[PDB]
């Protein structure tokens, strides 16, 4: 529970947290994403994507065009540090990543890249 967090995403297009803090001693960290509700992934699907705050607009605009089978992220996009797949209600997915990819000086963010969700579904990730 030091190096893992669970974030829920809902039928009301929200994540249940706005800020995730990763302790510096973790070597790898896991984010587990759940989706309470009843709506299918092509109506209200959600993923969790991590990048520098500066790259977030570019990933989201390109991802919307990639389609649901590419999890609304451009294939092999080098700006994405880590991501889950798009999940619908009653499903779940995790992603584990190397904490030393998060370097000193830069500001990081998480968001959902499903079309239209980023206005409400985003926040900050800080290593502490
Ligand atoms: Cu979403």
Swiss-Prot record:
TM region positions: none
Pfam families: Copper-bind (PF00127)
InterPro entries, alphabetized: Azurin, BlueCu_1, BlueCu_1_BS, Cu-binding_ET, Cupredoxin
Residues where Cu cation binds: 46, 112, 117, 121
Keywords: Copper, Disulfide bond, Electron transport, Metal-binding, Periplasm, Transport
Domain Plastocyanin-like: start-end pairs: 1-128
SS bond list: 3-26
Transmembrane helix is among the record's keywords: no
Function: Transfers electrons from cytochrome c551 to cytochrome oxidase.
Protein name: Azurin
């Amino acid at each position: 529970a030091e190096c893992k967090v669970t974030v829920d995403s809902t039928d009301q297009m929200s994540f249940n947290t706005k800020a995730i803090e990763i302790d510096k001693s973790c070597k790898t960290f896991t984010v587990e994403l759940t989706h309470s509700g009843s709506l299918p992934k092509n109506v209200m699907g959600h993923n969790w994507v991590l990048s520098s705050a500066a790259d977030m607009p570019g990933i989201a605009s390109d991802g919307m065009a990639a389609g649901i089978d590419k999890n609304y992220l451009k294939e092999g996009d080098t700006r994405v540090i880590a991501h889950t797949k798009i999940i619908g209600a009653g499903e779940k997915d995790s992603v584990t990543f190397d904490v030393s990819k998060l370097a000193a000086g830069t500001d990081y963010a998480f968001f959902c890249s499903f079309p239209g969700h980023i206005s409400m579904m985003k926040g900050t990730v800080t290593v502490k």
